[PDB]
Coordinates of C-alpha atoms and ligand atoms in Angstrom, one line a residue:
Chain A
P1 CA 23.9 -68.7 -57.5
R2 CA 22.2 -69.5 -60.8
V3 CA 22.4 -72.2 -63.3
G4 CA 25.0 -71.8 -65.6
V5 CA 27.3 -70.9 -62.2
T6 CA 30.6 -73.4 -62.5
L7 CA 32.1 -74.3 -58.9
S8 CA 35.6 -75.0 -59.1
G9 CA 36.2 -75.0 -63.2
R10 CA 34.8 -78.3 -62.4
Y11 CA 30.9 -78.6 -60.6
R12 CA 28.2 -76.9 -63.0
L13 CA 25.0 -75.7 -61.6
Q14 CA 21.7 -77.2 -63.8
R15 CA 18.6 -77.7 -61.9
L16 CA 17.4 -75.8 -57.9
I17 CA 16.6 -79.2 -56.3
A18 CA 15.4 -77.5 -52.9
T19 CA 16.1 -75.3 -50.4
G20 CA 17.0 -76.6 -47.1
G21 CA 18.1 -74.4 -43.8
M22 CA 20.9 -72.9 -44.4
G23 CA 21.4 -74.1 -48.1
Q24 CA 20.4 -74.2 -51.6
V25 CA 20.5 -77.7 -53.3
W26 CA 21.3 -78.4 -56.6
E27 CA 21.2 -80.5 -59.6
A28 CA 24.8 -80.5 -61.2
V29 CA 27.9 -81.9 -62.8
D30 CA 31.2 -83.4 -62.5
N31 CA 33.0 -81.5 -65.6
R32 CA 35.9 -84.3 -64.5
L33 CA 33.9 -87.9 -64.3
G34 CA 31.3 -86.8 -66.2
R35 CA 28.3 -87.8 -63.4
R36 CA 25.3 -86.0 -62.3
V37 CA 26.3 -84.7 -58.7
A38 CA 23.8 -82.9 -56.2
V39 CA 25.5 -80.0 -54.5
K40 CA 24.5 -78.0 -51.1
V41 CA 25.2 -75.0 -51.8
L42 CA 25.1 -71.5 -49.0
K43 CA 23.0 -69.3 -49.2
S44 CA 24.6 -66.0 -50.4
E45 CA 23.7 -64.0 -46.9
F46 CA 25.2 -67.1 -44.8
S47 CA 28.0 -67.4 -47.6
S48 CA 29.6 -64.5 -46.1
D49 CA 28.7 -64.6 -42.3
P50 CA 31.8 -67.2 -41.2
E51 CA 29.6 -69.2 -37.6
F52 CA 27.7 -70.3 -40.5
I53 CA 30.5 -71.3 -42.7
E54 CA 31.7 -73.4 -39.8
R55 CA 28.5 -74.6 -38.7
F56 CA 28.1 -75.7 -42.9
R57 CA 32.1 -77.3 -43.1
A58 CA 30.7 -78.9 -40.3
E59 CA 28.4 -80.5 -41.9
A60 CA 30.9 -82.5 -44.9
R61 CA 32.8 -83.6 -42.2
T62 CA 30.8 -85.8 -39.9
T63 CA 28.5 -87.6 -43.7
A64 CA 31.8 -88.3 -45.0
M65 CA 32.2 -90.3 -42.1
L66 CA 29.2 -92.0 -42.4
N67 CA 28.4 -95.6 -44.9
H68 CA 25.3 -97.0 -45.6
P69 CA 22.6 -97.2 -49.2
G70 CA 20.3 -95.3 -46.5
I71 CA 22.2 -91.7 -46.1
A72 CA 22.9 -90.2 -48.9
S73 CA 26.8 -90.3 -49.7
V74 CA 29.3 -86.8 -50.1
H75 CA 31.8 -87.0 -52.1
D76 CA 33.5 -83.2 -51.7
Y77 CA 33.4 -80.4 -50.6
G78 CA 34.7 -76.8 -51.6
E79 CA 34.9 -72.8 -51.7
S80 CA 34.7 -70.8 -54.8
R81 CA 33.6 -67.5 -51.9
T82 CA 30.8 -69.6 -52.2
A83 CA 31.3 -73.2 -49.7
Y84 CA 30.0 -76.1 -51.9
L85 CA 29.4 -80.0 -50.4
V86 CA 29.2 -82.6 -53.8
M87 CA 26.5 -85.2 -53.3
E88 CA 25.2 -88.1 -54.3
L89 CA 22.3 -87.3 -56.2
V90 CA 18.9 -89.3 -55.3
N91 CA 16.2 -90.0 -57.8
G92 CA 13.6 -89.0 -54.7
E93 CA 10.4 -87.4 -53.3
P94 CA 11.4 -86.0 -49.1
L95 CA 8.7 -88.3 -46.9
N96 CA 6.9 -84.9 -46.7
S97 CA 5.8 -84.7 -50.1
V98 CA 5.0 -88.2 -50.3
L99 CA 2.6 -87.8 -46.6
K100 CA 1.1 -84.5 -48.2
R101 CA -0.1 -86.9 -51.1
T102 CA -1.0 -90.0 -49.4
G103 CA -1.9 -88.8 -45.4
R104 CA 0.0 -92.5 -44.7
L105 CA 1.6 -95.1 -45.6
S106 CA 0.3 -99.2 -44.5
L107 CA 1.8 -101.3 -41.8
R108 CA 4.0 -103.5 -44.6
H109 CA 6.0 -99.5 -46.1
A110 CA 6.1 -97.4 -42.7
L111 CA 7.8 -100.8 -40.6
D112 CA 10.4 -101.3 -43.9
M113 CA 11.0 -97.2 -43.5
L114 CA 11.1 -97.2 -40.7
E115 CA 13.6 -100.3 -39.9
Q116 CA 15.8 -98.5 -43.3
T117 CA 15.7 -95.2 -41.4
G118 CA 17.4 -97.2 -38.2
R119 CA 19.4 -99.0 -40.1
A120 CA 20.8 -96.3 -41.4
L121 CA 20.9 -94.0 -38.5
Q122 CA 22.8 -96.8 -36.4
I123 CA 25.8 -95.7 -38.4
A124 CA 25.4 -92.3 -37.3
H125 CA 24.8 -93.8 -33.9
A126 CA 28.7 -95.7 -33.9
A127 CA 30.5 -93.3 -35.2
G128 CA 29.1 -91.3 -31.5
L129 CA 26.8 -88.9 -34.0
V130 CA 23.6 -87.0 -33.1
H131 CA 21.5 -86.4 -36.5
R132 CA 19.4 -83.3 -34.0
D133 CA 16.5 -82.7 -37.0
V134 CA 15.5 -86.3 -37.7
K135 CA 11.7 -84.9 -39.7
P136 CA 10.1 -87.0 -42.9
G137 CA 11.7 -83.0 -45.3
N138 CA 15.1 -85.0 -44.0
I139 CA 13.8 -88.4 -45.2
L140 CA 14.2 -89.4 -49.3
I141 CA 12.4 -92.5 -51.1
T142 CA 13.0 -93.3 -53.7
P143 CA 10.3 -95.2 -56.6
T144 CA 12.2 -98.6 -55.7
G145 CA 11.1 -97.9 -51.9
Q146 CA 14.8 -96.9 -50.9
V147 CA 15.1 -93.9 -47.6
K148 CA 18.1 -91.8 -48.0
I149 CA 18.6 -90.1 -45.0
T150 CA 19.7 -86.2 -45.6
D151 CA 21.0 -82.3 -43.8
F152 CA 23.1 -83.6 -41.1
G153 CA 23.1 -80.3 -40.8
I154 CA 23.0 -79.2 -36.8
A155 CA 24.8 -82.9 -35.5
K156 CA 26.3 -82.9 -32.4
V157 CA 11.1 -73.0 -35.8
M158 CA 8.1 -74.9 -36.2
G159 CA 10.0 -77.8 -38.7
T160 CA 12.2 -79.1 -36.1
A161 CA 9.7 -78.3 -32.9
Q162 CA 7.1 -80.6 -34.6
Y163 CA 9.2 -83.8 -34.4
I164 CA 11.7 -81.9 -30.8
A165 CA 12.7 -84.3 -28.0
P166 CA 12.2 -83.3 -24.4
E167 CA 15.8 -82.6 -23.5
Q168 CA 16.6 -80.5 -26.4
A169 CA 13.4 -78.4 -26.4
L170 CA 14.6 -78.5 -23.0
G171 CA 17.9 -77.0 -23.7
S172 CA 21.7 -87.6 -27.4
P173 CA 20.9 -90.8 -29.6
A174 CA 18.3 -92.0 -27.9
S175 CA 16.8 -88.0 -29.6
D176 CA 17.1 -89.5 -32.9
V177 CA 15.0 -92.6 -31.7
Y178 CA 12.2 -90.1 -30.4
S179 CA 11.9 -88.4 -33.6
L180 CA 12.1 -91.5 -35.4
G181 CA 8.9 -92.3 -32.9
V182 CA 7.1 -88.8 -33.5
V183 CA 7.7 -89.7 -37.3
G184 CA 6.7 -93.3 -37.5
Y185 CA 3.5 -91.7 -35.9
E186 CA 2.2 -89.2 -38.3
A187 CA 3.4 -92.6 -41.1
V188 CA 1.4 -94.9 -39.6
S189 CA -1.7 -93.1 -38.4
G190 CA -1.8 -89.4 -40.8
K191 CA -1.7 -86.8 -37.9
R192 CA 1.0 -86.4 -36.1
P193 CA 0.9 -86.5 -31.9
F194 CA 1.8 -83.1 -30.9
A195 CA -0.5 -80.5 -33.3
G196 CA -1.2 -76.3 -32.2
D197 CA -1.2 -72.6 -33.9
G198 CA 2.4 -72.3 -32.8
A199 CA 6.3 -73.8 -32.9
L200 CA 6.9 -72.9 -28.7
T201 CA 3.2 -75.2 -28.3
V202 CA 4.1 -78.3 -30.0
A203 CA 8.0 -78.4 -27.9
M204 CA 6.0 -77.3 -24.3
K205 CA 3.8 -80.6 -25.6
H206 CA 6.7 -83.1 -26.4
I207 CA 7.6 -82.4 -22.8
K208 CA 5.0 -81.8 -20.1
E209 CA 2.0 -83.5 -22.1
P210 CA 1.4 -87.1 -22.8
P211 CA 1.5 -88.6 -26.3
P212 CA -2.8 -88.7 -27.3
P213 CA -3.5 -92.6 -27.9
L214 CA -3.1 -94.3 -31.4
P215 CA -6.2 -95.8 -33.9
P216 CA -7.7 -98.5 -32.5
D217 CA -7.8 -99.8 -35.8
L218 CA -3.6 -100.4 -35.2
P219 CA -2.0 -103.6 -34.1
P220 CA -1.2 -103.8 -30.3
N221 CA 2.2 -104.5 -31.9
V222 CA 2.7 -101.0 -33.7
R223 CA 1.3 -99.4 -31.1
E224 CA 3.5 -100.4 -28.3
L225 CA 7.0 -99.7 -30.1
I226 CA 5.8 -95.7 -30.9
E227 CA 5.0 -95.7 -26.9
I228 CA 8.9 -97.5 -26.0
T229 CA 10.6 -94.7 -28.4
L230 CA 8.1 -91.3 -27.1
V231 CA 9.0 -91.4 -23.3
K232 CA 10.3 -88.0 -21.5
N233 CA 13.1 -90.1 -20.4
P234 CA 15.9 -90.8 -22.6
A235 CA 17.2 -93.7 -20.4
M236 CA 13.3 -95.4 -20.5
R237 CA 14.2 -95.7 -25.2
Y238 CA 16.2 -97.3 -27.1
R239 CA 19.7 -95.7 -27.0
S240 CA 20.0 -96.1 -30.7
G241 CA 18.6 -96.6 -34.3
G242 CA 19.5 -99.8 -34.7
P243 CA 18.1 -100.8 -31.2
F244 CA 15.4 -99.6 -32.5
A245 CA 15.1 -101.2 -35.7
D246 CA 15.8 -103.9 -34.4
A247 CA 12.5 -103.5 -32.2
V248 CA 10.6 -102.7 -35.6
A249 CA 12.1 -106.2 -36.7
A250 CA 10.0 -108.3 -34.3
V251 CA 6.8 -106.0 -35.0
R252 CA 7.1 -106.6 -38.7
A253 CA 7.4 -110.5 -37.6
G254 CA 4.5 -110.7 -35.8
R255 CA 6.8 -110.7 -32.3
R256 CA 6.4 -108.0 -29.7
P257 CA 9.1 -105.3 -29.1
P258 CA 11.4 -105.5 -26.2
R259 CA 12.8 -103.5 -23.1
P260 CA 15.7 -101.4 -23.8
Chain B
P1 CA 53.9 -93.1 -56.1
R2 CA 56.1 -93.7 -52.4
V3 CA 54.1 -93.2 -49.0
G4 CA 54.4 -90.1 -47.3
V5 CA 53.3 -88.5 -50.2
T6 CA 50.3 -85.8 -50.9
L7 CA 48.1 -85.6 -53.6
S8 CA 47.2 -82.2 -54.1
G9 CA 47.9 -80.9 -50.6
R10 CA 44.6 -83.2 -49.5
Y11 CA 45.0 -86.9 -50.3
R12 CA 48.1 -88.0 -47.9
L13 CA 48.6 -92.0 -49.8
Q14 CA 49.6 -94.4 -46.7
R15 CA 49.3 -98.2 -47.0
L16 CA 50.0 -99.6 -50.8
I17 CA 47.1 -101.9 -50.6
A18 CA 47.3 -103.5 -53.8
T19 CA 48.9 -103.5 -57.3
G20 CA 46.8 -104.3 -59.8
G21 CA 47.5 -103.8 -64.1
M22 CA 47.1 -99.8 -64.9
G23 CA 47.9 -99.2 -60.5
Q24 CA 48.6 -99.5 -57.3
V25 CA 45.0 -99.8 -54.7
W26 CA 46.6 -97.5 -50.8
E27 CA 45.3 -97.1 -48.4
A28 CA 45.4 -92.2 -47.8
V29 CA 43.1 -89.9 -46.2
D30 CA 41.6 -87.0 -47.1
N31 CA 42.7 -84.1 -45.2
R32 CA 39.4 -82.2 -45.8
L33 CA 37.2 -84.0 -45.2
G34 CA 38.7 -85.8 -42.5
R35 CA 38.0 -88.9 -44.0
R36 CA 39.9 -92.2 -45.0
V37 CA 39.6 -93.4 -48.5
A38 CA 41.4 -95.6 -50.8
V39 CA 43.6 -93.9 -53.3
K40 CA 43.9 -95.9 -57.5
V41 CA 46.9 -94.4 -58.4
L42 CA 48.5 -94.7 -62.2
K43 CA 51.6 -96.8 -61.3
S44 CA 55.1 -94.1 -62.3
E45 CA 55.5 -96.8 -65.5
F46 CA 52.5 -96.3 -66.7
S47 CA 51.9 -92.4 -65.7
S48 CA 53.1 -90.3 -68.6
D49 CA 52.0 -92.2 -71.3
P50 CA 48.6 -91.0 -73.4
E51 CA 47.5 -94.6 -73.8
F52 CA 47.0 -95.7 -70.5
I53 CA 46.4 -92.2 -69.5
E54 CA 42.8 -92.4 -71.0
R55 CA 41.9 -96.1 -70.1
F56 CA 42.1 -95.1 -66.6
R57 CA 40.4 -91.7 -67.6
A58 CA 38.0 -94.1 -69.0
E59 CA 38.0 -96.3 -65.5
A60 CA 37.9 -93.1 -63.7
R61 CA 34.3 -91.8 -65.3
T62 CA 32.8 -96.2 -65.5
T63 CA 33.2 -96.4 -62.4
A64 CA 31.6 -92.6 -61.2
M65 CA 28.2 -93.5 -63.5
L66 CA 27.7 -96.2 -60.9
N67 CA 25.4 -95.8 -57.6
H68 CA 24.6 -100.0 -55.6
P69 CA 26.5 -101.0 -52.6
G70 CA 27.7 -104.0 -53.6
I71 CA 30.3 -101.9 -56.4
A72 CA 33.0 -99.3 -54.8
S73 CA 32.0 -95.9 -55.0
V74 CA 34.3 -92.9 -56.7
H75 CA 34.6 -90.0 -55.0
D76 CA 36.7 -87.8 -56.7
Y77 CA 39.4 -87.9 -59.7
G78 CA 42.6 -85.7 -60.1
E79 CA 46.3 -86.1 -61.4
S80 CA 48.6 -83.8 -59.0
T81 CA 50.6 -88.9 -61.5
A82 CA 46.8 -89.3 -62.5
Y83 CA 45.0 -90.7 -58.9
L84 CA 41.2 -91.7 -58.1
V85 CA 39.2 -91.4 -54.5
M86 CA 37.3 -94.4 -54.1
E87 CA 35.3 -95.2 -51.2
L88 CA 37.6 -97.2 -48.9
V89 CA 36.8 -100.9 -47.4
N90 CA 37.1 -103.1 -45.2
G91 CA 37.8 -106.4 -47.2
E92 CA 39.5 -109.0 -47.8
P93 CA 39.4 -110.3 -51.9
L94 CA 37.8 -113.6 -52.9
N95 CA 41.2 -114.7 -54.0
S96 CA 42.8 -115.0 -50.5
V97 CA 40.0 -115.8 -48.6
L98 CA 39.5 -119.1 -51.3
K99 CA 43.7 -119.7 -50.5
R100 CA 43.0 -120.0 -47.1
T101 CA 39.8 -121.4 -46.9
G102 CA 40.2 -123.8 -50.0
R103 CA 36.5 -124.0 -51.1
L104 CA 33.5 -122.0 -49.8
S105 CA 30.3 -123.5 -47.5
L106 CA 27.4 -123.8 -50.1
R107 CA 25.5 -121.0 -47.7
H108 CA 28.3 -118.3 -48.1
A109 CA 29.0 -119.6 -52.2
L110 CA 25.7 -119.1 -53.0
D111 CA 25.4 -115.3 -51.3
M112 CA 28.5 -114.2 -52.6
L113 CA 26.8 -115.2 -56.0
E114 CA 23.8 -113.8 -55.1
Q115 CA 25.7 -110.2 -54.1
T116 CA 27.8 -109.8 -57.2
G117 CA 24.9 -110.8 -59.7
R118 CA 23.4 -107.9 -58.1
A119 CA 26.1 -105.8 -58.1
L120 CA 26.8 -106.5 -62.0
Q121 CA 23.9 -106.4 -63.2
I122 CA 23.8 -102.5 -62.3
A123 CA 26.9 -101.8 -65.3
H124 CA 24.8 -104.5 -66.9
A125 CA 21.6 -102.4 -67.1
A126 CA 23.8 -99.1 -67.6
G127 CA 25.1 -101.0 -70.1
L128 CA 28.8 -101.9 -69.5
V129 CA 30.4 -105.3 -69.1
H130 CA 33.3 -105.4 -66.4
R131 CA 34.8 -108.1 -68.6
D132 CA 37.5 -109.1 -66.3
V133 CA 35.0 -110.6 -63.6
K134 CA 37.6 -113.0 -61.3
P135 CA 38.3 -113.5 -57.2
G136 CA 41.0 -111.0 -56.9
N137 CA 38.0 -108.3 -57.7
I138 CA 35.6 -109.3 -56.0
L139 CA 36.6 -108.4 -52.1
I140 CA 34.3 -110.0 -48.5
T141 CA 33.8 -107.9 -45.2
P142 CA 34.1 -109.2 -42.2
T143 CA 30.0 -108.7 -42.1
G144 CA 29.9 -111.3 -45.5
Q145 CA 28.8 -107.9 -47.6
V146 CA 30.4 -108.3 -51.7
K147 CA 32.5 -104.5 -53.4
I148 CA 33.0 -105.5 -56.6
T149 CA 35.8 -103.5 -58.4
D150 CA 38.2 -103.0 -61.3
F151 CA 36.8 -101.3 -64.3
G152 CA 39.7 -101.2 -65.9
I153 CA 38.8 -102.9 -69.1
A154 CA 34.8 -102.4 -69.0
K155 CA 33.9 -101.8 -72.2
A156 CA 30.3 -99.9 -73.1
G157 CA 44.1 -112.9 -65.5
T158 CA 41.4 -112.8 -67.8
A159 CA 42.5 -116.5 -69.2
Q160 CA 41.7 -118.4 -66.4
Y161 CA 37.4 -116.8 -65.7
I162 CA 37.6 -115.5 -69.7
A163 CA 34.3 -116.5 -71.8
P164 CA 34.6 -119.0 -74.7
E165 CA 33.3 -116.1 -76.8
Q166 CA 35.8 -113.4 -75.1
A167 CA 38.1 -115.6 -76.2
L168 CA 36.9 -115.5 -79.7
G169 CA 37.5 -112.5 -79.7
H170 CA 33.6 -111.1 -79.8
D171 CA 31.5 -108.0 -78.8
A172 CA 31.6 -107.4 -74.7
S173 CA 27.7 -108.7 -73.7
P174 CA 26.9 -109.0 -69.8
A175 CA 26.3 -112.9 -71.2
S176 CA 30.7 -113.0 -70.5
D177 CA 30.4 -111.6 -67.1
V178 CA 27.5 -114.4 -66.1
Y179 CA 29.6 -117.1 -67.2
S180 CA 32.6 -115.2 -65.4
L181 CA 31.1 -115.2 -63.0
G182 CA 30.1 -119.0 -63.1
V183 CA 34.2 -119.8 -63.4
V184 CA 33.9 -118.7 -59.3
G185 CA 31.2 -120.1 -58.9
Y186 CA 33.0 -123.8 -59.6
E187 CA 36.4 -122.7 -57.6
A188 CA 34.2 -122.2 -54.5
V189 CA 31.7 -125.0 -54.7
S190 CA 34.4 -127.4 -55.5
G191 CA 37.9 -126.0 -54.4
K192 CA 39.3 -125.7 -57.6
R193 CA 38.9 -124.2 -60.8
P194 CA 37.3 -125.7 -64.3
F195 CA 40.3 -125.4 -66.6
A196 CA 43.9 -125.9 -65.9
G197 CA 47.3 -125.8 -67.4
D198 CA 50.6 -124.4 -68.1
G199 CA 50.2 -121.2 -70.3
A200 CA 47.5 -119.1 -70.6
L201 CA 46.5 -120.3 -75.0
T202 CA 45.5 -123.9 -73.2
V203 CA 43.0 -122.2 -70.3
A204 CA 41.5 -119.7 -73.3
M205 CA 41.4 -122.9 -76.0
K206 CA 39.7 -125.1 -73.0
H207 CA 37.6 -122.5 -72.1
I208 CA 36.2 -122.8 -76.3
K209 CA 36.5 -126.4 -77.2
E210 CA 36.7 -128.2 -73.2
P211 CA 33.8 -129.5 -71.6
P212 CA 34.4 -128.2 -67.5
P213 CA 35.1 -131.2 -65.8
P214 CA 31.9 -132.8 -63.2
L215 CA 31.3 -130.9 -59.8
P216 CA 31.9 -132.9 -56.6
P217 CA 28.9 -135.6 -56.3
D218 CA 28.7 -134.9 -52.7
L219 CA 27.0 -131.1 -53.9
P220 CA 23.1 -130.5 -54.6
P221 CA 22.2 -130.8 -57.9
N222 CA 20.2 -128.1 -57.9
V223 CA 23.4 -126.1 -57.6
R224 CA 25.1 -128.7 -59.3
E225 CA 22.6 -127.3 -62.2
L226 CA 22.9 -123.8 -62.0
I227 CA 26.5 -123.9 -62.5
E228 CA 26.2 -126.4 -65.2
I229 CA 23.8 -124.0 -67.5
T230 CA 26.1 -120.2 -66.8
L231 CA 29.5 -122.9 -68.0
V232 CA 27.0 -122.9 -71.7
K233 CA 29.7 -122.3 -74.7
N234 CA 26.9 -119.9 -76.5
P235 CA 26.3 -117.2 -75.0
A236 CA 22.6 -116.9 -76.0
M237 CA 21.8 -120.0 -74.2
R238 CA 23.2 -118.3 -70.5
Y239 CA 21.8 -116.1 -68.8
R240 CA 21.1 -112.8 -70.3
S241 CA 22.6 -110.4 -67.1
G242 CA 23.6 -109.8 -63.6
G243 CA 20.0 -109.7 -62.4
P244 CA 18.8 -113.0 -64.4
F245 CA 21.6 -115.1 -62.4
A246 CA 20.8 -113.7 -59.3
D247 CA 17.7 -114.3 -59.6
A248 CA 18.5 -118.6 -60.5
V249 CA 21.1 -118.3 -57.3
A250 CA 17.9 -117.2 -55.5
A251 CA 15.8 -120.1 -56.5
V252 CA 18.6 -122.2 -55.9
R253 CA 19.1 -121.0 -52.4
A254 CA 14.9 -121.3 -51.1
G255 CA 16.3 -125.1 -52.2
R256 CA 14.4 -125.3 -55.9
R257 CA 16.1 -126.2 -59.1
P258 CA 17.5 -122.8 -61.0
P259 CA 15.2 -121.6 -63.8
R260 CA 16.0 -121.7 -67.0
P261 CA 17.9 -118.7 -68.8
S262 CA 15.1 -116.3 -70.6
Ligands
0BD301 C1 28.6 -115.3 -47.9 C2 30.1 -114.4 -47.8 C3 30.2 -112.7 -48.1 C4 31.4 -114.9 -47.1 C5 31.8 -115.0 -46.4 C6 33.4 -115.4 -45.8 C7 33.6 -117.0 -45.0 C8 35.3 -116.4 -45.2 C9 33.3 -117.6 -44.4 O1 31.4 -114.0 -45.3 C10 30.5 -114.0 -43.9 O2 29.4 -114.6 -44.6 C11 28.3 -114.2 -43.2 C12 27.0 -114.0 -44.1 O3 25.8 -112.9 -44.8 C13 28.7 -113.6 -42.6 O4 27.5 -114.5 -41.2 C14 26.2 -113.1 -40.9 O5 25.8 -112.9 -42.3 C15 24.0 -112.0 -41.9 C16 23.4 -112.2 -42.8 O6 21.7 -112.2 -42.4 C17 23.3 -112.4 -40.3 O7 22.2 -113.2 -39.8 C18 24.3 -112.6 -39.6 O8 24.9 -111.4 -38.6 C19 25.3 -113.2 -39.9 O9 26.6 -113.7 -38.4 C20 29.3 -113.8 -42.0 O10 29.6 -112.8 -40.5 C21 31.0 -113.3 -42.5 O11 32.5 -113.2 -42.6
CJJ302 N1 19.1 -82.4 -47.5 S1 17.3 -81.5 -47.2 O1 17.2 -79.6 -47.8 O2 16.8 -81.8 -46.1 C1 15.9 -81.8 -48.9 C2 14.9 -81.6 -49.6 C3 14.5 -81.4 -50.3 C4 15.8 -83.0 -51.3 C5 15.1 -83.3 -52.3 N2 14.4 -83.3 -52.7 C6 14.4 -84.0 -54.3 C7 15.8 -84.7 -54.5 CL1 15.0 -85.6 -56.5 C8 16.7 -84.7 -53.8 N3 17.5 -85.3 -54.1 C9 18.7 -85.7 -53.7 C10 19.1 -84.7 -52.5 C11 20.8 -84.9 -52.1 C12 21.6 -85.1 -50.9 C13 21.8 -83.5 -50.4 C14 21.4 -83.0 -50.1 N4 21.4 -85.6 -53.2 N5 20.2 -86.4 -53.7 N6 16.7 -83.7 -52.6 S2 17.2 -82.3 -50.6
CJJ303 N1 40.6 -102.7 -57.8 S1 41.9 -104.5 -57.7 O1 43.1 -103.5 -58.1 O2 41.7 -105.2 -58.4 C1 42.6 -104.8 -56.3 C2 42.6 -105.9 -55.7 C3 42.9 -105.8 -54.5 C4 41.7 -104.8 -53.4 C5 42.0 -105.0 -52.3 N2 42.4 -105.4 -51.3 C6 41.7 -105.3 -49.7 C7 41.6 -104.3 -48.9 CL1 40.9 -104.5 -47.1 C8 40.9 -103.4 -50.2 N3 40.3 -102.4 -50.2 C9 39.5 -101.3 -50.4 C10 40.1 -101.1 -52.3 C11 38.9 -99.7 -53.1 C12 39.3 -99.2 -54.0 C13 39.5 -100.2 -55.3 C14 38.5 -99.7 -55.1 N4 38.6 -99.7 -51.4 N5 38.7 -100.6 -50.4 N6 41.2 -103.6 -51.9 S2 41.6 -103.3 -54.1

């Protein structure tokens, strides 16, 4: 769609915020409530296909099950036909753009935003859900330092391949924990663990190859925590975002990260 | 607005949670998103009156304007009778909590006071005054989270918690909400409201002229001071907003004296 488009005679679009996996994120107005909201609309070509509509209907129902200030909230879902998902409008920048300008984040910043993400993901984990795509691009950062987990689009290309779980790369809530570890690694050092020219290389590295060592400037408790999340076996790592967030909180207090 | 009823063919009303002044609070189901929501429906008596319809539309718009975990979120607004789709909170009004407990422990009372201050500061920063802060409007979850509700009489029942200036027909200000919260604070720590009597006029006149009765000597002085400052009759000599109030509570929690309002 374009700027002047009023979805179902209520949601008048304004600015195009981003262009995600299958849908476009839009800055919009609710004519009934008179408030600014974010609207996710399916791309012109995907709006015609029923496999892309039933994948988008799933994102709506999944996100609406979650209630946490660390999860971009869902208000509505409609079809005008253009399938749209009405959400909480967040004044933030993705961790994608943050780490591009800053390289890495300070020990205080990284561990605050890691626990924030774990406490956010545990809400999704306790409901029996798995995000399946935890990456800086799906983590929004407001100027007040608040994390907002977005895009549950594939909840059960090189983008997902850079932080993919080894079991997923082969064919669970431990996977979101794993991915967040890879996210943590990049945020604490300023360079991803597995890196290559292609997507299939980075994904194959995640299975057979062991993660490269972290810089020695990093404390032992932070180093250990990244290594417990980055194990090939999904049993040898934290079964959910919560036990992980609990282990992040220990490293924040000066303590060691526990064994799951 | 009867039980079974499915609003706009989407929101099935299940259980009447509460009955306010303008409308009813219902535990409902969003058949579209497949989630359990709370629906505020206009009382059938007022459902067709234009004065109440505008008052309900304003409440819908005011609440939707606020985004904070300590305030119950707005999802949708419709007219099937007007209805307001909101976040479903598994909580209990401070009203009923205090009826069972009598008085909250200093640790709990100060935690609920801080949370309410922080939540109201969002509305105050937006330039809105709640105008009806009372224990019945403060939801408490089993995890101990405060959820602020009912912006029905908010400006850009009341009697027991009304601010002196608010009783004197003065313009609304965030300091008025600060006073009302101090009345909730006085009640939470002592198990008794400061001003009493049959008839609202007496209670309202007590908020204007009568000084609040002394708090139990069993209480810490840092706590007693915080309540005493918030209950000043002059809003200029009181905490400006929910934020400054919450900061003074944070100082008391840390075992310090509350800072003097700016
Ligand atoms: C303070 C208000 C909201 C009123 C109070 C109700 C009254 C009737 C007793 O609610 C209690 O609040 C405390 C403090 O948050 C909770 O403990 C947890 O507090 C946490 C806060 O840090 C954690 O330490 C831990 O989960 C505690 O158990 C209780 O589970 C909850 O029942
Ligand atoms: N979802 S995505 O495609 O990963 C994605 C990529 C980039 C996104 C982005 N960037 C900047 C801002 Cl200011 C923003 N605001 C939002 C977004 C949302 C929710 C509806 C998705 N609420 N507020 N969003 S969102
Ligand atoms: N708003 S009121 O009339 O003061 C009022 C009095 C009592 C209320 C109450 N009691 C128990 C529960 Cl479990 C509950 N849950 C809610 C309610 C909402 C909607 C209204 C914001 N979300 N979750 N609400 S609400």
